[PDB]
From a paper:
Deltex proteins are a family of E3 ubiquitin ligases that encode C‐terminal RING and DTC domains that mediate interactions with E2 ubiquitin‐conjugating enzymes and recognize ubiquitination substrates. DTX3L has a distinctive domain architecture as it substitutes the WWE domains and proline‐rich region with three domains termed D1, D2 and D3. The N‐terminal D1 and D2 domains of DTX3L mediate homo‐oligomerization, and the D3 domain interacts with PARP9, a protein that contains tandem macrodomains with ADP‐ribose reader function.
Using mass‐spectrometry, we identified that the amino acid sequence of the crystallizable fragment started at A126 and ended in Q200. Despite the anisotropy, we observe a well‐defined electron density for the protein, for which we determined that the D2 domain comprises three antiparallel β‐sheets packed against two α‐helices. This assembly continues the antiparallel β sheet of the monomer with six hydrogen bonds between the strands. The smaller interface is formed between the short β2 strands and only two inter‐chain hydrogen bonds are formed. Taking all into account, dimer and tetramer are stable in solution, but the structural features suggest that the dimer might be a more stable assembly.
Numbering used by the authors:
A (entry chain A), B (entry chain D), C (entry chain B), D (entry chain C): 132 to 191
The structure:
């Protein structure tokens, strides 16, 4: 089965814009998002999507 | 410059025993954990730690 | 003087409709939310915000 | 049936010592806790229990 049933990550919203963090919807379409007027602040799902999101923000 | 301010993982406690999950606090001594009648169910820390915990459990 | 830095609540999506849970963004404009297929599933914010949400929903 | 399935609160560990925070074990022996070497950082449980902990901490 799965090692991690789910993984959640608090995003740095000082470091990355609404526009940068909004791409996560296209990068990982089935990632669950905690979102404000400030855009995506937390993400939840498979460890593979958290890695993919970390890779993506790491490059910005 | 933290990408993920924190990261939290839900451990699959069906796949892994209390003894197997117990080592996580030696593996990552500054980890934070949530602990029931069958030991460690959830963990919180750096991305690096959650990657090391995934690596470790992945090899059992 | 924050006692709770943030507070997250899991909503009883069986008890309340998408239309009932949808008002939360109008009730609490500054709130953060996570939206599955049947609307808002989880909410993050201030204690006071989570309190007013409990009240609003308790009277449906 | 209940309004909030669970509630989680990030505790202000700057405003409240390890020892003040440790009493939450006595206050709500049923509350699930995220804890490391500065003690309880996050609590998860029933709305009523979150209220009691906020009520306790606010009375300090």
């Amino acid at each position: 089965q799965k090692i991690f049933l789910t993984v959640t990550a608090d995003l740095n919203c000082n470091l990355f814009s609404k526009e940068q963090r909004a791409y996560i919807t296209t990068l990982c379409p089935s990632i669950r998002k905690m979102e404000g007027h400030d855009g995506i602040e937390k993400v939840c799902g498979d460890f593979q999507d958290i890695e993919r999101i970390h890779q993506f923000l790491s490059e910005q």
